[PDB]
């Protein structure tokens, strides 16, 4: 902050004004600026080039837009609103990609089932009519003061209706529409970067959501896309108007003139800086020509929303904020969009260590989502309780969604633990017969200034694990300064993996013999052999379970849905192993260890 305050002063050639200080505190906060993670992120193999980030072609006609986000900070302060708006936020991300939101896969890490967090997710999900197709839940006392709420959202989008994420020429205007702007979430970006949860950020920082408006938002926006009206888009989240407008024009190397007086307000006595920095929910920024702006506003207002043309895209790369004829702030756009970059730590992996059994706790979110009329994975090819969510795109087309993490391991060795989490994400995907296509990741870390190695260790293994598996990063999020009184959370990388699968080829469980396929321990040089064995057996029609516990309660519960009973003698396994459970009529034949352990019947 201080080091940053002094650079701004360098750059500005004076001290900032009140407005500029609120502005850069937002844009230059770890949350918005990614100071510590920008360089590590660049080294990541990405689905980048592919015009649009988070967008992955499925069959040359349809693509899957997906991304995982977090709302850890706010969820610790206000479980309900923080968790709810957590989903509201990531949903708007997939919508801005041009895709109709279709699925939500949550990844929760708490010291116990925090009602408010589970209910904020269920209510908001139910009101927007977007199903939760799965959920990863980890309970550990290590997340007591900093629960982790990571939400993955995915959507189907036509390859010929991809929306851009930037402004492209002088003369375009930017429309802000959706719910009216208020004071909520003001400074939440900085609140979410606060080296500590017990810092000067509180209730004035958490956003309030309203799914009814969000529902209206997707309808309005998709109709805008379908009418060739949207030439660019970016949802309003952290930093609100400021963040959306500056980045949109920043990405296109253009500038902008913002008219805050044009921002539909919910609270008319707000000051100009509050309008600029407000983080009110359910809002979207649209880049377009002056001609299409009328139809856009017509559509927005017709869907019971509010909106007006707020900014003009200019050639000069300056960010000029006006309020009527008053000049509120004026700074170089690229100054605001390029927070100071931190040098990184070169991390060289050590010997794979022997992991100790770190007692954690899992639980089928479905069993916990009933209390709040929220069904998990009711419309999927096969139950997500078996390891992966499989959704239908077409009769003979589909995709899978997987959310995995291994903080229990990473806590002992961030590199290997983290790297293992991803490989295991590959096993899950392959196990349902899906082909790994891309990853969306959420980096949840502590304080990078106090511990730079742990971050590097996490980011470098994501790189290596992507290189090893050949599965690139399509999108993602970084959440740092996830601490309390300095007490850091366990380094948790959440891997969201997208796979391609034909709904017709997905196996269902039925009476069969059970075999433990693989090794009881881990060696990087045989992982691909395990994948090969899984690919072969899946092709032959085998049902396959890939779990750290080999067989979980959720599993036993899911088999119940088929009236099937499982009786086996689980092999002794280490915290990190390379073994999968295979169900078939005959003994599996692969070049990997095979042991018959029991049966599935009734
Ligand atoms: O509603 C929009 N959500 C989008 C968004 O950008 N939200 C911002 O992220 C913070 C949580 O970050 P974390 O503690 O999870 O790292 C939250 O407080 C918002 O400022």
Curated annotation (Swiss-Prot):
One of its GO terms (cellular component) is cytoplasm. Its EC number is 6.3.5.3. It catalyses: N(2)-formyl-N(1)-(5-phospho-beta-D-ribosyl)glycinamide + L-glutamine + ATP + H2O = 2-formamido-N(1)-(5-O-phospho-beta-D-ribosyl)acetamidine + L-glutamate + ADP + phosphate + H(+). The active site is at 31, 71 (proton acceptor). ATP 1 binds at residues 34, 67, 441, 476. ATP 2 binds at residues 106, 135-138, 387, 428, 548, 555. Substrate binds at residues 70-73, 92, 188, 207, 279-281, 479. Gene3D superfamilies: Formylglycinamide ribonucleotide amidotransferase, C-terminal domain, PurM-like C-terminal domain, PurM-like, N-terminal domain. Keywords: ATP-binding, Cytoplasm, Ligase, Magnesium, Metal-binding, Nucleotide-binding, Purine biosynthesis. It comes from the Bacteria. Mg(2+) 2 binds at residues 93, 235. One of its GO terms (molecular function) is phosphoribosylformylglycinamidine synthase activity. Mg(2+) 1 binds at residues 69, 477. Monomer. Part of the FGAM synthase complex composed of 1 PurL, 1 PurQ and 2 PurS subunits. Purl possesses an auxiliary ATP Binding region which is not catalytic, but able to bind additional ATP. The conformational changes associated with its binding could have a regulatory role in formation of the PurLSQ complex. Part of the phosphoribosylformylglycinamidine synthase complex involved in the purines biosynthetic pathway. Catalyzes the ATP-dependent conversion of formylglycinamide ribonucleotide (FGAR) and glutamine to yield formylglycinamidine ribonucleotide (FGAM) and glutamate. The FGAM synthase complex is composed of three subunits. PurQ produces an ammonia molecule by converting glutamine to glutamate. PurL transfers the ammonia molecule to FGAR to form FGAM in an ATP-dependent manner. PANTHER family: PHOSPHORIBOSYLFORMYLGLYCINAMIDINE SYNTHASE SUBUNIT PURL. This is Phosphoribosylformylglycinamidine synthase subunit PurL. It comes from Thermotoga maritima (strain ATCC 43589 / DSM 3109 / JCM 10099 / NBRC 100826 / MSB8). The lineage of its organism: Bacteria, Thermotogati, Thermotogota, Thermotogae, Thermotogales.
